[PDB]
Write a protein that binds this ligand. Structure first.
Ligand SMILES: O=C(O)C[C@H](NC(=O)c1cc(F)cc2[nH]cnc12)c1ccc(Br)cc1
Length: 167
């Protein structure tokens, strides 16, 4: 039993809700919140900008120190950093950004990072400003992640769609 409330169950291990991931993280304090990161950990907009803003820019400060020490992530890669006031940990995962021409097949590699964590609160990788089809992203998520994933979808319209077209 865990503290996630109000999710529709899609599979044995994938759950989905219409929620603002920032507000959901602040209320659940999950062990792991996933950020839709880029390789530079520059959290300017989308989910990343919103999560970072909710940390009063502490996520960005920590991220800049990480990059200065380690260099950029790989597309499809991840790193674990602090969750600040939102979660114990933040798993920064780099999905491919279609608006940069990155190979969508890297989306499966990106979701594989979730399997290193028993339970996660997560956005749909490569959705939103990353330009991928959120329905394809949901399919890859379901077919790749084996751990328990609670997907928050900010847009109510999108959500209702994802549910009605799910197989
Ligand atoms: O709806 C989703 O969950 C996926 C994606 N979300 C974002 O891009 C997004 C951006 C942001 F700045 C803050 C956020 N907090 C939660 N998600 C976001 C999206 C896709 C299509 C459309 Br139309 C609208 C949104």
């Amino acid at each position: 039993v865990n503290s996630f409330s109000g999710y529709l169950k899609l599979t044995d291990n994938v759950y989905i809700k219409n929620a603002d991931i920032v507000e959901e993280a602040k209320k659940v304090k999950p062990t792991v919140v996933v950020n839709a990161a880029n390789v530079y950990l520059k959290h300017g907009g989308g989910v990343a900008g919103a999560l970072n803003k909710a940390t009063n820019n502490a996520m960005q400060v920590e991220s800049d120190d990480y990059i200065a020490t380690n260099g950029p992530l790989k597309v499809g890669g991840s790193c674990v950093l602090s969750g600040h006031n939102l979660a114990k940990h933040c798993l920064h995962v780099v999905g491919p950004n279609v608006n940069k021409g990155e190979d969508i097949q890297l989306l499966k590699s990106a979701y594989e990072n979730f399997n290193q964590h028993e339970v996660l609160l997560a956005p749909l990788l490569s959705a939103g400003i990353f330009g991928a089809d959120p329905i394809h992203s949901l399919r890859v998520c379901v077919d790749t992640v084996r751990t328990n994933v609670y997907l928050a979808v900010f847009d109510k319209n999108l959500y209702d769609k994802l549910v009605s077209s799910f197989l």
